[PDB]
Design a protein around this ligand. Structure first.
Ligand code: Y6U
Ligand code: GAR
Length: 200
């Protein structure tokens, strides 16, 4: 399956996906990396592996739907079957999300439903949980409707900061995201007709 990865930042997950899709048994290939922020560190990793890159400054579009269109254009150009949000920070329009229902995955640094939203690790430390994790889900319109593909739990050591906790969690993200991709791309896990995750 032809995959596009959308980044915004460092791109350590992108690298996680790049490494796994280059494995001989992989059911996916990363034909295009698309960032909405220029000069970001994840663009140089895409280039280092010879993957085409495109930058789409969200700041230059009237609204979201005109920004997503520019994205969906590139996605069609490279005949993309699967979209991977890996550090992508923009919210997506309803139409753009409906089009890729069942075909878009996101990696989130928390054990959803807990600590939704952007600053997951910040909330987790204020609440003071002993266990956090990451979640790979399908991107539905409501951030709490996405069907959950894989999760992995991570401990919260005493005296953790966002800088240390997020570092630990990312070692799981780098596991379950390549796996959840491989599930979806191989046609093993599929969003079912009833909208709940359907194994096969
Ligand atoms: N439609 C839909 N789109 C997306 C995109 C990712 N996800 C997965 C959920 C994780 C998430 C939670 C919160 C934010 C966020 O806060 N975005 C702001 C901040 C921008 C800034 O801080 O500059 C913005 O875009 O303005 C982003 C992602 C979904 C989803 O589930 N649904
Ligand atoms: N709201 C989405 C979100 O917070 N995504 C998070 O951003 C990081 C991406 O890091 P990377 O730039 O190393 O791939 C990851 O920790 C991921 O969970």
């Amino acid at each position: 399956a032809r995959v596009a990865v959308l980044i915004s930042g460092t791109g350590s997950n992108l690298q996680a996906l790049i490494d796994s899709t280059r494995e001989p048994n992989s059911s996916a290939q990363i034909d295009i990396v698309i960032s909405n922020k220029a000069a970001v560190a994840g663009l140089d990793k895409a280039e280092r592996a010879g993957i085409p890159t495109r930058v789409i400054n969200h700041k230059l579009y009237k609204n979201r739907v005109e920004f997503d269109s520019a994205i969906d254009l590139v996605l069609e150009e490279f005949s993309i079957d699967i979209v991977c949000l890996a550090g992508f920070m923009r919210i997506l329009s309803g139409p753009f999300v409906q089009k890729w229902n069942g075909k878009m995955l996101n990696i989130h640094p928390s054990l959803l439903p807990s600590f939704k939203g952007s600053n997951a690790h910040e909330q987790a430390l204020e609440t003071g949980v002993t266990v956090t994790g990451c979640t790979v889900h399908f991107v539905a319109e409501d951030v709490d409707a996405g069907q959950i593909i894989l999760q992995e739990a991570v401990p919260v050591k005493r005296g953790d900061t966002v800088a240390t906790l997020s570092e630990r969690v990312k070692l799981a993200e780098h596991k379950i995201f390549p796996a959840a991709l491989q599930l979806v791309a191989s046609g093993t896990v599929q969003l079912g007709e009833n909208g709940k995750i359907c194994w096969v």
